[PDB]
Structure 1
Amino acid sequence: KLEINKFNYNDPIDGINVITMRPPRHSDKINKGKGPFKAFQVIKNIWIVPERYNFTNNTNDLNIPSEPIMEADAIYNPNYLNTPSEKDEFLQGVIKVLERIKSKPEGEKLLELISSSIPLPLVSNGALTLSDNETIAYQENNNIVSNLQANLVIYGPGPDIANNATYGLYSTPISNGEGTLSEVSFSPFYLKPFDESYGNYRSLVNIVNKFVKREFAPDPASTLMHELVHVTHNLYGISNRNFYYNFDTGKIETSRQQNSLIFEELLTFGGIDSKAISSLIIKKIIETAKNNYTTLISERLNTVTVENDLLKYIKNKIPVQGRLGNFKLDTAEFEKKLNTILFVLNESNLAQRFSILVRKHYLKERPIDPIYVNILDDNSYSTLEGFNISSQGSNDFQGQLLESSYFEKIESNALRAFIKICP
């Protein structure tokens, strides 16, 4: 079955699963001189890099901002993740979260999909051939030793140490059916709480109706799975973050409006807000993806004259019929796979399978200060049950209640600078 590789941060370089990686974004001016960074292959084609994400315009400065703060629940600390002990803690936390995801069939299948679903390569001399859209470089002493396959690289957080995000490497392949390598910025220890109505908590006797909005922490496996759903969209080349869904009209628009949400986030979160999408929208999204794939099969796949392992990978990713030089899209099987990746795979549906509580709506009504939690302590967080550990009376979402003892308060200043954890 799918295997998760364990590592300690001080494990030696071997060129197989432990490398020093040149940043995928090394050619951008903002990234001159950065790296290489120690990287660990946790699952085939999935790499963990215990470093702050610092490689795009909006993540390049990790310092406390010098401009109006427009995320009132952010926490800044440019020194987080700069010691070997914090890097090993991060590595262990990501490994443990992935082990949790693998512990249910739906999560195992998601990880298998990301591992196997390589971007569609370019063709050279009749053969599918690898590019930097499908690989990372092992750099040693300013030489490239090898190029290793990669669909996903997971880093630590950007400037806001409690934020999470996904970035596709190349912007044309992210939305034209080819797909692109993805980077994820993830924080397993610094979490942003949310509100949900609940009635099983200590309450004053003079309160008649106890069922009210209470504060909860997310399970960081749900946080990561949300980003992994974005990754799947990026690997199949079916992202488009230029569309907004307007809740007032039920229509897709190409600019943000009063009461709207980026459509990629509406789908990736799922839940109640995706249950009333019109048939017009669904048909247009499916038809766009089908047309993009039909074009790639005729213009690129049918120029392949060399059968190699990359072609094997691609036929497992893309449902096709026919023979070399004359493939056609398998419409029924492509439709089934596409509707799974767009409408079945989402944070809300996955959380239900894991007995994890998530909020009702992607957009939160108010900011709540982040907390710190040591998820490596099995008494607080287990791979099989997360925070909601039955033997400790914390089933049925109760272990996610924010007043649980393992959720530690963080003090910050008015500029949102980290001061300390209150243990």
Structure 2
Amino acid sequence: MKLEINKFNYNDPIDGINVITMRPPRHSDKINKGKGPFKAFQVIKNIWIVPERYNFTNNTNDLNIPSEPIMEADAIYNPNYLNTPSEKDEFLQGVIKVLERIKSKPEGEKLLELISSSIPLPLVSNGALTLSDNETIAYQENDNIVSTLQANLVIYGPGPDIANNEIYGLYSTPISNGEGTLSEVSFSPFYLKPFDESYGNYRSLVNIVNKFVKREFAPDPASTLMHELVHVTHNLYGISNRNFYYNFDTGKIETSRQQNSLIFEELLTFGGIDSKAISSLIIKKIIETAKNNYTTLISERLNTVTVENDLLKNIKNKIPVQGRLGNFKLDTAEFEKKLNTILFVLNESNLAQRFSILVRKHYIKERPIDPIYVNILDDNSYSTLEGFNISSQGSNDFQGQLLESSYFEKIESNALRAFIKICP
């Protein structure tokens, strides 16, 4: 069946199929007592949109201006953002439009198909693969669980910083042992953080001899979400380990941050020039670790399955295996090929090239730039087929991402980074 993106209005009635009231996956943590349930929409099979602020972890529990100086220089705080039905519907339309943009090119459609079908490896109960809260969300009505529905990804609005984007895996052992875990993404399609890039096609003073200089650009929020979707793929395949750092001075992996380092998960997910010189030693160690984790799961868990059900069919489509029930073995050549695609081909820089989207040269930015607001629901500013770089308006070749473009609106903030207003 061709991949379907479900459209919705925030006021669509509950149906128990694609529209539910969802109990938070992290409902058991004491910081989440009494939160929810929240209206949720199944935009793609096993992919849910929840138009609510992300505040289900220790670092996101308080949406107010922080009580410590921990705040980041380009953060914008507003505890009231996304508390009205109109802002929730705008958020829902924005996430749906960004997903339609991602599905508009074959590389984006295949990424969405991969997240939709790549369920975490379930536990075995009475010889059958059986679902847990690591692979599902609960439809709660009053104080009763009506049903559990499969979920590989739940997309929420932003945490405390309304211009920040983050990903959280639900269970820390499955995220790195080859099983995989449900992911929650906090995403902001309307509040963007600009970046610097050298460019020469902009209005310049006549006395400037060389106009090729660093200029400010806004990111395409589809590139921002695709970045998080690559992290999601790593989380679903259980190959994410955030404890490793890449040291740019030595070219070595380390288990702690050093002077000139970057979390290795971010180095791979962003890609670009910084991932082109990774040593064969690092690449072989990553592949051998994943292969050993998968060999162990096939031997200790998949070979204990005695019940052929739809979940087993789904897992055989996710994990390349050979053999028959009770005697499966990893298909090494096909496993290596899929793993290298998910780790080294799938990244924000490679996907941005396919969509003609400008991204920065390095994951780490040299300086903070104040966030802007942009109404991406306006087709005159942002289209699903071309994003901000609309050819019929002469904005091809990344010019529509130039920050002086009229649709990027300034946000006035106070010294504490508190949101004051959008300047139209």
**TM more than 0.5:** yes
In 1, Cα distance between equivalents of 2:308 and 2:186: 36
Query: 1:232-271, aligned counterparts within 5 Å?
Result: 232-271=233-272
What does the per-residue CA deviation read over 1:329-349, in whole Å, with 9 as the maximum and x for residues that have no partner?
000000000000000000000
| Residue 384 of structure 1: how far off its partner (Å) | 0.1
**In structure 1, the residue corresponding to 2:53 is in which secondary structure?**
coil
| TM-score, normalisation: structure 2 | 1.00
Q: RMSD in angstroms over aligned alpha carbons? A: 0.3
**In structure 2, the residue corresponding to 1:337 is in which secondary structure?**
helix
**In structure 2, the residue corresponding to 1:293 is in which secondary structure?**
helix
Residue 348 (structure 1) aligned with residue 349 (structure 2):
yes
| Residue 403 of structure 1: how far off its partner (Å) | 0.1
**In structure 2, the residue corresponding to 1:237 is in which secondary structure?**
coil
1:149 is matched with 150
2:173 is matched with 172
**In structure 2, the residue corresponding to 1:411 is in which secondary structure?**
strand
In 2, Cα distance between equivalents of 1:200 and 1:327: 58
| Residue 264 of structure 1: how far off its partner (Å) | 0.2
* Count of residues in correspondence between the two structures: 423
| TM-score, normalisation: structure 1 | 1.00
What does the per-residue CA deviation read over 1:361-418, in whole Å, with 9 as the maximum and x for residues that have no partner?
0000000000000000000000000000000000000000000000000000000000
What does the per-residue CA deviation read over 1:30-59, in whole Å, with 9 as the maximum and x for residues that have no partner?
000000000000000000000000000000
In 2, Cα distance between equivalents of 1:70 and 1:418: 14
Which portions of structure 1, spanning 4 or more consecutive aligned residues, are displaced by more than 2 angstroms? none
In 1, Cα distance between equivalents of 2:67 and 2:113: 42
**In structure 1, the residue corresponding to 2:198 is in which secondary structure?**
strand
1:96 is matched with 97
In 2, Cα distance between equivalents of 1:166 and 1:113: 17
In 2, Cα distance between equivalents of 1:211 and 1:101: 31
What does the per-residue CA deviation read over 1:114-145, in whole Å, with 9 as the maximum and x for residues that have no partner?
00000000000000000000000000010000
In 2, Cα distance between equivalents of 1:91 and 1:208: 47
**In structure 2, the residue corresponding to 1:183 is in which secondary structure?**
strand
Residue 361 (structure 1) aligned with residue 362 (structure 2):
yes
| Residue 95 of structure 1: how far off its partner (Å) | 0.1
**In structure 1, the residue corresponding to 2:90 is in which secondary structure?**
helix
**In structure 2, the residue corresponding to 1:179 is in which secondary structure?**
coil
What does the per-residue CA deviation read over 1:225-276, in whole Å, with 9 as the maximum and x for residues that have no partner?
0000000000000000000000000000000000000000000000000000
| Residue 66 of structure 1: how far off its partner (Å) | 1.3
What does the per-residue CA deviation read over 1:96-121, in whole Å, with 9 as the maximum and x for residues that have no partner?
00000000000000000000000000
What does the per-residue CA deviation read over 1:14-39, in whole Å, with 9 as the maximum and x for residues that have no partner?
00000000000000000000000000
1:63 is matched with 64
In 2, Cα distance between equivalents of 1:333 and 1:301: 18
| Residue 152 of structure 1: how far off its partner (Å) | 0.2
In 2, Cα distance between equivalents of 1:54 and 1:421: 24
What does the per-residue CA deviation read over 1:181-239, in whole Å, with 9 as the maximum and x for residues that have no partner?
00000000000000000000000000000000000000000000000000000000000
What does the per-residue CA deviation read over 1:153-180, in whole Å, with 9 as the maximum and x for residues that have no partner?
0000000000000000000000000000
**In structure 2, the residue corresponding to 1:223 is in which secondary structure?**
helix
| Residue 69 of structure 1: how far off its partner (Å) | 3.8
2:106 is matched with 105
**In structure 1, the residue corresponding to 2:224 is in which secondary structure?**
helix
Q: Percent identity?
A: 99
1:126 is matched with 127
In 1, Cα distance between equivalents of 2:376 and 2:44: 21
2:309 is matched with 308
Q: Which structure 1 residue ranges, 5 or more long, are not aligned?
A: none
